[PDB]
Design a protein around this ligand. Structure first.
Ligand SMILES: Fc1ccc(C2=NNC3=NCCN3C2)cc1F
Length: 279
């Protein structure tokens, strides 16, 4: 399948070169997979989700996304126009309030919620979780992410936006999950992206168009935007049977575009997520 005039990041993940605008992908499109978006919620009524999104849990007075961040991330995972895996099922877990903040205890509870809740969902091709959030180092937060991964969920987490080594942030610093840095449309490391040995992969993160609340769209930047590209890619590859939740991060790194990013610090991987789709 070819989507013309796609957002640059979708085109980038199906290309050996920057500077193109068509996204190419296998029509299976993540059908039969599920992606949890652990964030501020998802506006499931957005036409771009086509009925494939739903809120499954909130820790606040509403499950609605009163912020936009979670809706934007969910759109990059799986919206019809802005998403990597255009036929995946999207499940929202609202651990962040409408200002984008949340207590670590609530985030940990949300991760353990997903590890159990997947057993209440039909995801025969596999389960992914996208965590576009983070803070300072916490062994407890890292352990929660490691439990979620161990339970059979491909966990992708944002590296953070501090232009610093991600070893001092959680869940970015947890070794067993997939820690995602951000790049721009010219294959430069995004100016804010964290780096370091704990990164596994880069994805598009600067100027990413996706869904927003009120049935709208907008372009924003962050490692929060790169993370759902990798989450959606994992769902897409698991549906194709190319990898599993336990091995998908390693598979994405093994099949990535290598050595093509600029301003990558010595000791950080130079690997850009790539679907290796041959139309
Ligand atoms: F490696 C690079 C090569 C070209 C550019 C460019 N800056 N801005 C720009 N506007 C239209 C085309 N174009 C190329 C950036 C890079 F980082």
């Amino acid at each position: 399948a070819a989507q013309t005039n796609a957002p640059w990041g979708l085109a980038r993940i199906s290309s050996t070169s920057p500077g193109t605008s068509t996204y190419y992908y296998d029509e299976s499109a993540g059908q039969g997979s599920c992606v949890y978006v652990i964030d501020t919620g998802i506006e499931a009524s957005h036409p771009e989700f086509e009925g494939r999104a739903q809120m499954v849990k909130t820790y606040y007075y509403s499950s609605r996304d009163g912020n936009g961040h979670g809706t934007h991330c969910a759109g990059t995972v799986g919206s019809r126009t802005y998403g990597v895996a255009k036929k995946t099922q999207l499940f929202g877990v609202k651990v962040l309030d409408d200002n984008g903040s949340g207590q670590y205890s609530t985030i940990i509870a949300g991760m353990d919620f997903v590890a159990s809740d997947k057993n209440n969902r039909n995801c025969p091709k596999g389960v992914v979780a996208s965590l576009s959030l983070g803070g300072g180092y916490s062994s407890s937060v890292n352990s929660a992410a490691a439990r979620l991964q161990s339970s059979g969920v491909m966990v992708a987490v944002a590296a953070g936006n501090n232009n610093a080594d991600a070893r001092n942030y959680s869940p970015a610093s947890e070794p067993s999950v997939c820690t995602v840095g951000a790049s721009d449309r010219y294959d430069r490391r995004s100016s804010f992206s964290n780096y370091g040995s704990v990164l596994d992969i880069f994805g598009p993160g600067t100027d990413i168009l996706s869904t927003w609340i009120g049935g709208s769209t907008r372009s924003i930047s962050g490692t929060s935007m790169a993370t759902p590209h990798v989450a959606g890619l994992a769902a897409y590859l698991m549906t194709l049977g190319k990898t599993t939740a336990a091995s998908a991060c390693r598979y994405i790194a093994d099949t990535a575009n290598k050595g093509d990013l600029s301003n990558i610090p010595f000791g950080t991987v130079n690997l850009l997520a790539y679907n290796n789709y041959q139309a």
